[PDB]
């Protein structure tokens, strides 16, 4: 059911696996993510950006997740604000029923980042909500101080290829769950699916699978995944548009799109190590 | 709020206007219908087919509607099962929170249609839910008996050019709200939008706007509207896919798709006479 972010990630931290954090913007994305978790027996970290929240309305973002939660009550799921930008934004998410919030203040100096993170932490912890923050390449010594002072629950350190030595140093010093941002891999089958549907990816490349695996071994426990899901989703939509010019049944477009998105999530759950962890 | 279908249609009945009954299959469709109703100050009839219920899950179908209703508490909204095909399906919609159900038994002989409709009515009225049934072209004396025996709240008479004389006789004999099925009126702007995006409608003919207006003057009060919405929506999706083969932000595909659907709903509400009726 709907649980504090730290419940899922403390366990990932202790046992040494990564929990994919999958963004959604509507019902179709959320359904395929949830079906993936059900089929892989995997905990679900559900993410909504400020943009997706404005699109849906926070009442709907939370409401739909709560419906999905009742549909699979055996799956632990956290509802997590991805890249909150202001304290007020984090407070609204907490009020709306999110069980995890990220405040991104990494563009500030250390002292200002720490003070804004600490403000969000106080508010969220008072309502029983976990907090993510961002630092950074990250200075591991200030990461150590940042975590001890802010009491944030998980940290996204800037490590990039990936600086795996820096990651192990941050992990050793902070002893908390760590988050990797922009962690989509853009797999070969998804890119081939998107190009077969006529799409163009501008030669964009993700983090290869072996580097995701190595970052989990380095101590990453939350793995932000968004871009992969969208490319796998829209490529089916583009395909359906191309092949039947008379097709306007939305289900005919989004049923295969859901299936491709679900498959990306399933595979990523297996890759990161959250498969069969319920 | 979520009200009995009869509550909305009894008012439409007494005042001689039509209320569009708009199908939905996911959040995007539902959001745009509601924004249309909010901007036209019109009551909302929201319809979900057995197919769309399967696609969403009846718990999500009702759950999303209940969230939207709290977002616009001032709007009268009925949640209606479109073309229910078994008693059991009607009973499931009633138990899940639908406030109106249609049992489609029009392929049966008069006696079996009446028997099945009556069984639905006893069940649905016990739970405070309104019932639609279907007959037919329609025999108006059959309609008069059917309505008086079944106590169904509204009836879809098969009247389709559309037989105005027959509609008026049915209206006179039954004196209940009447519903018009297959009443999408593929508007020129919408058709041009679909074709401009490379769509192919196969030369499908929609009901002329004047024939929708004449049915409302004849006593139609619920106008089933689906195809029009899906064409407008998918037209924008095809457009976004065409004009940027690197676009896979779902909001970029569906925000304009919502707006096009909303505009269809707004114009229909004005056409049928439900604008400014709250
Ligand atoms: Na985040
Ligand atoms: Na109906
Ligand atoms: Zn950032
Ligand atoms: Zn970041
Ligand atoms: Zn129909
Ligand atoms: Zn029909």
Swiss-Prot record, chains A, B:
Residues that coordinate or bind Zn(2+) 1: 83, 181
Cofactor: how bound: Binds 2 Zn(2+) ions per subunit. One is catalytic and the other provides a structural contribution.
InterPro entries: Aldolase_TIM, Class_II_FBP_aldolase, FBA_II, Fruc_bis_ald_class-2
One Pfam entry name: F_bP_aldolase
A biological-process GO annotation: glycolytic process
Coiled-coil positions: none
UniProt keyword annotations, A-Z: Glycolysis, Lyase, Metal-binding, Zinc
GO molecular function: fructose-bisphosphate aldolase activity; zinc ion binding
Binding-site list for D-glyceraldehyde 3-phosphate: 49
Catalytic residue positions: 82
SUPFAM superfamilies for this protein: Aldolase
Pathway(s) this gene product operates in, as recorded in its UniProt entry: Carbohydrate degradation; glycolysis; D-glyceraldehyde 3-phosphate and glycerone phosphate from D-glucose: step 4/4
Cofactor: Zn(2+)
Binding site for Zn(2+) 2: 104, 134
UniProt: dihydroxyacetone phosphate binding residues: 182-184, 224-227
Enzyme Commission no: 4.1.2.13
Chemical reaction(s) catalysed: beta-D-fructose 1,6-bisphosphate = D-glyceraldehyde 3-phosphate + dihydroxyacetone phosphate
Functional summary from the UniProt entry: Catalyzes the aldol condensation of dihydroxyacetone phosphate (DHAP or glycerone-phosphate) with glyceraldehyde 3-phosphate (G3P) to form fructose 1,6-bisphosphate (FBP) in gluconeogenesis and the reverse reaction in glycolysis.
Assembly and oligomerization: Homodimer.
Family (UniProt): Belongs to the class II fructose-bisphosphate aldolase family.
NCBIfam families: cbbA, fruc_bis_ald, PRK05835.1
Protein name listed in UniProt: Fructose-bisphosphate aldolase
Organism the protein comes from: Helicobacter pylori (strain ATCC 700392 / 26695)
Organism classification: Bacteria, Pseudomonadati, Campylobacterota, Epsilonproteobacteria, Campylobacterales
Gene: fba
